[PDB]
């Protein structure tokens, strides 16, 4: 259809514990800046800065393993 | 927390029948364009151009009544 | 999702879908070349339909209100 | 089906995907307004990629003959 | 969601909450002047807590995992 | 009242609210990084507004006096 | 906004009958001493010493039940 | 009885419009710092710094006139 | 209020107050030399009473629960 | 009344009142644990003042003979 798109205008400042995270997605390229959104065990959603080591590590891990 | 913000880059082109709509909200000023998001009875979410009048009409009705 | 593809209809069904086959529907994006209802069945079959048809709209109404 | 929706890309990804995320590709229908490669990740995600881009071309080539 | 206000803690509770008073939590936006955990009580109250305390991170884990 | 979180606005609505959407307001704590007026709508929503705008101070007066 | 904070400098000396109490709250950590404030059926407000046990008892009961 | 006492730990930063204010009181001397609390037309309550000109002016005025 | 005086009882009434005279009651501050119920009548008469008396406590209960 | 509550001061004001706020005074009962002057403002507010303080003494004197 024509749903709204998820964008991030601010990033969490805290590294999340690995086992708090159960999934991720990357925000559209239409958004004004790049971002990763992590889904948690309690199903919360968290904007996270893709420039940071820990974010990439979790992304690599959720994708590959 | 630091969750995603809903943003509309593309708007629906049809006019929604009034009775398909149960709720609405308006996208953050941080988005690159103004938008109204309508919620339908099937719990779907549709971007809508706030410059269209039926959009304004339904918004006043949902707010006031 | 990120930058996934959009669903678009380039033809409309010519045969009416049995109403009880259909469990859901969506409208295709306005980015598409033409408007279209996509009907969804229980076995997850996807059927493009002409929005200007009367049974299409009748189905859409039943799905949305009932 | 008899008249299924077609996958089309209108917006591309601005990111170069990690090659090791990508396990497959496919090209969008000629019926689409524009040509696109859609990459498919290990996780079954779908990423529209702009065929004009060199990484996109290189990725396809590598998938095909490797 | 439009432009509603953000929850920020400028002070932390100095008392420790009995674990069975708590039923949920969240952390404050990075936009705030300091980090904080906000617990939600059975009676539906909201309590700013210092994230550097042991009980605070214990509760958060327990809430998040179990 | 114990140690609940403080409401702070980090961004202001860019739209002007129809006067008859609004039914109450408050101003944010001086503890916040910037000043702000938060309006409460008929549908009970909360909207951060820029205190330096004309309509914002008009509404506030009207709400406060009449 | 920027309203006053409730603080207890003197505590009540009697034990409130349970059924006089309808609600409670706990004074901000900014105050100079810990306190529980009980609300009565006549909507009065009574500081109470959190170190006293009937105080704790009633608090658990109001929260849990 | 033994009610809680109103204390202020932070002061408004905005000078209130005179006709928003309908009353004042001064906070107990038991509180950790001196303060004035203004009551408004809508019956809100506002901690205000007594060191400031505008506060004293309103205090003088509500007292004398 | 600011630093207003406290109400304290230094004697207790020796005559029982007609129950229907009484519309409200309060307990005197613990800062006082002795405990006391202060009963309030319709014409705003203030009457100190011994908390250990049975009619005093009976009145207090009726006022608080009914 | 037959046994009315007595006004007593346990805490004093740390502020020197503006002389022009004060329209009257009275002294608390000898039954009180401590001696106090209670000032009465234009607005009928009541302020316990510490008789040890010079401004308090001066205020009383001025009220009495002026």
From Swiss-Prot, chains A, B, G, H:
This is MIP-1-beta(3-69). It comes from the Eukaryota. It comes from Homo sapiens (Human). The chain holds residues 28 to 92 of 92 of the full protein. Disulfide bonds join 7-31, 8-47. The gene is CCL4. The lineage of its organism: Eukaryota, Metazoa, Chordata, Craniata, Vertebrata.
Swiss-Prot record, chains C, D, E, F, I, J:
Transmembrane segments: none annotated. It comes from Homo sapiens (Human). The gene is CCL4. Disulfide bonds join 8-32, 9-48. This is MIP-1-beta(3-69).
